[PDB]
Amino acid sequence: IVGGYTCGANTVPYQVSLNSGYHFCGGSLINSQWVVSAAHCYKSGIQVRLGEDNINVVEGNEQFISASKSIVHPSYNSNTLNNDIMLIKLKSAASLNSRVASISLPTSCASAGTQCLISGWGNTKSSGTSYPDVLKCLKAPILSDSSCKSAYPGQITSNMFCAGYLEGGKDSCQGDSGGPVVCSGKLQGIVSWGSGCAQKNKPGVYTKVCNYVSWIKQTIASN
């Protein structure tokens, strides 16, 4: 997160860190046994880390649970990042408490101009490089589809939306991939892609979760 703020320990209780010997992507806890992330975050050998603030210190509220299965969306296209969404099933259920909690799936899609909360342990500069140890947060608005399409012509599908600031300075970044965009108490986006981070006229591009609720519910009901 570029241009954000320190969240506060366990104030984003649905945020997870995906670890494959090191933190590599975020995700969101949607019930006691399932996490949503980005398909471009796929790796073998994922451990899900819940209740994290400082990812480099064991502070006492963490739960570390290995993934039993990963399921990339059937229509994921790694070239275009269309359908950039993946489910991860935990080997054992998480214990839900004030520090570890699930986030609701949306019933309706979110509105342009809604201010959302984006969070992660990704890079905090442009191509300066500096990765934080504690969780960072950013408030950012949903941009109109026409502004999104103008910023990335020929690249935006109906399964993507843009959020952030056209002036630049505030954005998600590498390492925040797979993490949440929460608007009005619902998971509306997944950190997906962008040209650089926090560059002028290059806002963040997010997977549109409300287009995937049927797939998520059917997959959880069968696995």
Could you tell me the two tokens for 144? 């109109």
| Single-letter residue type at 37 | S
Residue 221: CB atoms within 10 A of its CB come to: 7
Q: Which is nearer to Ca ion, 54 or 219 (CB)?
A: 54
Consult the annotation and say whether 147 binds a ligand. no
> Hey, which residues between 29 and 58 contact Ca ion (CB under 5 A)?
52, 54
173 closest CA partner among 200, 146, 191? 191
Q: What does the per-residue mask of binding to Ca ion show for 56-85, with x meaning CB under 5 A?
A: ---x--------------------------
Question: Residue 84 carries which side chain, given as an amino acid letter?
Answer: D
Assess whether 40 carries a catalytic annotation. Answer: yes
174 is in an annotated binding site: yes
Catalytic residue, candidates 17, 73, 84, 119: 84
| Partners of 205 in beta bridges | 162, 193
Does residue 167 have a known ligand-binding role?
no
* The one catalytic residue among 28, 37, 119, 177: 177
Q: Could you identify the residue written with the tokens 């320190």?
A: 6
* Residue 108 marked as a ligand binder: no
Q: Is position 192 annotated as part of the catalytic site?
A: no
- Of 52 and 84, CB closest to Ca ion: 52
The residue to which tokens 């299965």 are assigned = 69
Of 40, 53, 176, 192, which one is the catalytic site residue?
A: 40
Q: In the complex, what is the shortest distance from the CB of residue 88 to Ca ion, in angstroms, rounded to a whole number?
A: 19
Could you confirm whether 177 is annotated as catalytic?
Answer: yes
Q: Is residue 54 part of an annotated ligand binding site?
A: yes
Number of residues that bind Ca ion (CB under 5 A): 3
Among the listed residues 61, 63, 52, the one whose alpha carbon sits nearest the alpha carbon of residue 25: 52
DSSP string, 136-192: EEEEEEBPPHHHHHHHSTTT--TTEEEES-TT-S-B--TT-TT-EEEETTEEEEEEE
Site residues, Ca ion (CB under 5 A): 52, 54, 59
Q: Give the active site residues.
A: 40, 84, 177
Annotated binding-site ranges: 52, 54, 57, 62, 171-172, 174-175, 177
In the annotated binding site for substrate, the residues are 171-172, 174-175, 177
